[PDB]
Write a protein that binds this ligand. Structure first.
Ligand SMILES: Brc1nc2nn[nH]c2c(Br)c1Br
Length: 334
């Protein structure tokens, strides 16, 4: 039988109509600068693919962020570099300032523009109802741009959103997992963080598209308005689907499985069970009532869908009543 093919409802062929140089990142030539132009000041943290430092550009004494890339295939380094240059100057996208290599260790490193970020473990506890709508609108500006540019982030989560709350600025960072969308291509489902993986990654459906980012965004919105971090708290990839199925119900899950003829892992046979689709009022209590509204629930409900085709696009999300007040204040400032 095999899975049913799928295509994105928006920006399906944008990369096809580009010159081959735009998406053929393997043939991209990189001009490696000298890392001596930067002096590391502080370690801002580290992850599985890189360790991040705050550095100073000794030529003009401006703050930058140096991200020393951990050993991955050069093909994947050019991918992140090509994507960052294609998205350069876009709304709420991090700005790649330079590409350098250590003269001694010869290790590649990326240099980004500095951001004054407050970690969401201290910031999301302080966000008002308006702040969530405002910053979600900013993330949506970034997602709509890169999707329109044929690029698919595949790792949307609070750790990858730097917010300057004093200046109300926001930047979407960490594009090491981003990929170009091409209709018909089957991608690796081993992407994104566990708590933000879309159902298509959990049931191993490889022909996904930009809508994968919209599920991750719905997981962020759910945790912010309900004050439950994370919202789907699974112990592994298989239990992650059971946590989703206990909220969105199992009826729409098996309809999704049947629609795309997805071969379900036999491990899911005994753990999914049968669950109803819970109304969002079960997650509202005295601590989060000021962040929940009929608009927030209607908007959240339209993001968290099994069928990736039925999720809102980034532009459709920006047109939701949930953002009406943010759009108006933006207009007068204009
Ligand atoms: Br500010 C800032 N903080 C980070 N923490 N991890 N990666 C980071 C990046 Br890229 C920037 Br820019």
């Amino acid at each position: 039988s095999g899975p049913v093919p799928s295509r994105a409802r928006v920006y399906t062929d944008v990369n096809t109509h580009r010159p081959r140089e735009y998406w053929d990142y393997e043939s991209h030539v990189v001009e490696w600068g000298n890392q001596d132009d930067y002096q590391l000041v502080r370690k801002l943290g580290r992850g599985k693919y890189s360790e991040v430092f705050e550095a100073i550009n000794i030529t003009n004494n401006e703050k930058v962020v140096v991200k020393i890339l951990k050993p991955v295939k050069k093909k994947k380094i050019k991918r992140e570099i090509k994507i960052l240059e294609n998205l350069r100057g876009g709304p709420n996208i991090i700005t790649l300032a330079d590409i350098v290599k250590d003269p001694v260790s010869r290790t590649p490193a990326l240099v980004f523009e500095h951001v004054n970020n407050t970690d969401f473990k201290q910031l999301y506890q302080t966000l008002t109802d308006y702040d969530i709508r405002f910053y979600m609108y900013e993330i949506l500006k970034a997602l709509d741009y890169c999707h329109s540019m044929g690029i698919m982030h595949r790792d949307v989560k609070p750790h990858n959103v730097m917010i300057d709350h004093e200046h109300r600025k926001l930047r979407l960072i960490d594009w090491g997992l981003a990929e170009f969308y091409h209709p018909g291509q089957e991608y690796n489902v081993r992407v994104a963080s566990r708590y933000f993986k879309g159902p298509e990654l959990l049931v191993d459906y490889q022909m996904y598209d930009y809508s994968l980012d919209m599920w991750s965004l719905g997981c962020m919105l759910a945790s912010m308005i309900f004050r439950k971090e994370p919202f789907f708290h699974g112990h592994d990839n298989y239990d992650q689907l059971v946590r989703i199925a206990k909220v969105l119900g199992t009826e729409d899950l098996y309809d999704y499985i049947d629609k795309y003829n997805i071969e379900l892992d036999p491990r899911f046979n005994d753990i999914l069970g049968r669950h109803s689709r819970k109304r969002w009022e079960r997650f509202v209590h005295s601590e989060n009532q000021h962040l929940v509204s009929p608009e927030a629930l209607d908007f959240l409900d339209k993001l968290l869908r099994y069928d990736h085709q039925s999720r809102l696009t980034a532009r459709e999300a920006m047109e939701h009543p949930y953002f009406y007040t943010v759009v108006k204040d933006q207009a007068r400032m204009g």
